Design a protein around this ligand. Structure first.
Ligand SMILES: *C[C@@](*)(O)[C@H](CCCNC(N)=[NH2+])NC(=O)CNC(=O)[C@@H](N)CCC(=O)O
Lengths: 8, 248
């Protein structure tokens, strides 16, 4: 949880 | 919302868009949500009020566009919609706005958490940021109190928190603001949440991981001089949530 993926 | 940042299902991967169906084929957007475990979403009570049927509600996880399918999204049945046995609201506020939906796959299983399908961290006990902390909300909210179409692309905005000393004041909400709800706004009249936004995320990351600090509930007018936005502080509801999630 709180695991916000990275797609920048 | 009235902030300014169309975003996607990868910026707020835990957000659940909640829909209600109709005898005549369609569906319309009610309120937001937040995954907790695989099969438990969690919104506000004033959404399922006038139409309290757990059967005529469909729920979407992994979807950024409003009235259009986002590939790699999961549709659910609300196999159990239990609300808060103390919810009530007056001529302004709403108290105890918090409900839990237990979802199940049309095939028979819970959420399979992945890139888009993700869950939030619950706040610990009596733990909330200070009164300056910028936190971030989202939703398919109303772009204007007066406006009437719900923007087509998921939104997002950051907002500063406010104190009891602050909100309890005369030019604000006086004694309508209680200790089981957080007040939030920007310097003045620039950003806020709004209708359609309810049942969804006040987001502050604490100690590292981004947690479910609050939940959008009410406020007089969207983005207004001396008029914050109120969220149901999940802090105090921690046992309630945990008390239903396991057995009954
Ligand atoms: C149920 C939910 O969709 C909304 C969220 C409103 C959030 N508004 C702001 N500015 N953050 N909740 C309600 O509509 C609950 N009732 C009220 O907000 C009323 N006090 C409305 C008063 C008004 O519109 O001036």
């Amino acid at each position: 949880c709180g695991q916000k993926t990275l797609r920048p | 919302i009235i902030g300014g940042e169309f975003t996607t299902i990868e910026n707020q991967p835990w957000f659940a868009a909640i829909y209600r169906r109709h005898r005549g084929g369609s569906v319309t957007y009610v309120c937001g949500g937040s995954l907790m475990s695989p099969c438990w979403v969690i919104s506000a009570t004033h959404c399922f009020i006038d139409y309290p049927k757990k059967e005529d509600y469909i729920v979407y996880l992994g979807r950024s566009r409003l009235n259009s399918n986002t590939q790699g999204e999961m549709k659910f049945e609300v196999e159990n919609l239990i609300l808060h046995k103390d919810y009530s609201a007056d001529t302004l506020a709403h108290h105890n706005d918090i409900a839990l939906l237990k979802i199940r796959s049309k095939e028979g299983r819970c959420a399979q958490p992945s890139r888009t399908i993700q869950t939030i961290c619950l706040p610990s006990m009596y733990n909330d940021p200070q009164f300056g902390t910028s936190c971030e909300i989202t939703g398919f909210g109303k772009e204007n109190s007066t406006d009437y179409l719900y923007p087509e692309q998921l939104k997002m905005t950051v907002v500063k928190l406010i104190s009891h000393r602050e909100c309890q004041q005369p030019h604000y909400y006086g004694s309508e603001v209680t200790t089981k709800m957080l007040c939030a706004a920007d310097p003045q009249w620039k950003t806020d949440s709004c209708q359609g936004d309810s049942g969804g995320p006040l987001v502050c990351s604490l100690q590292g991981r981004m947690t479910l600090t609050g939940i959008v509930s009410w406020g007089r007018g969207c983005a207004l001089k001396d008029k914050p936005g109120v969220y149901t502080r999940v802090s105090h509801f921690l046992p309630w949530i945990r008390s239903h999630t396991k057995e009954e």
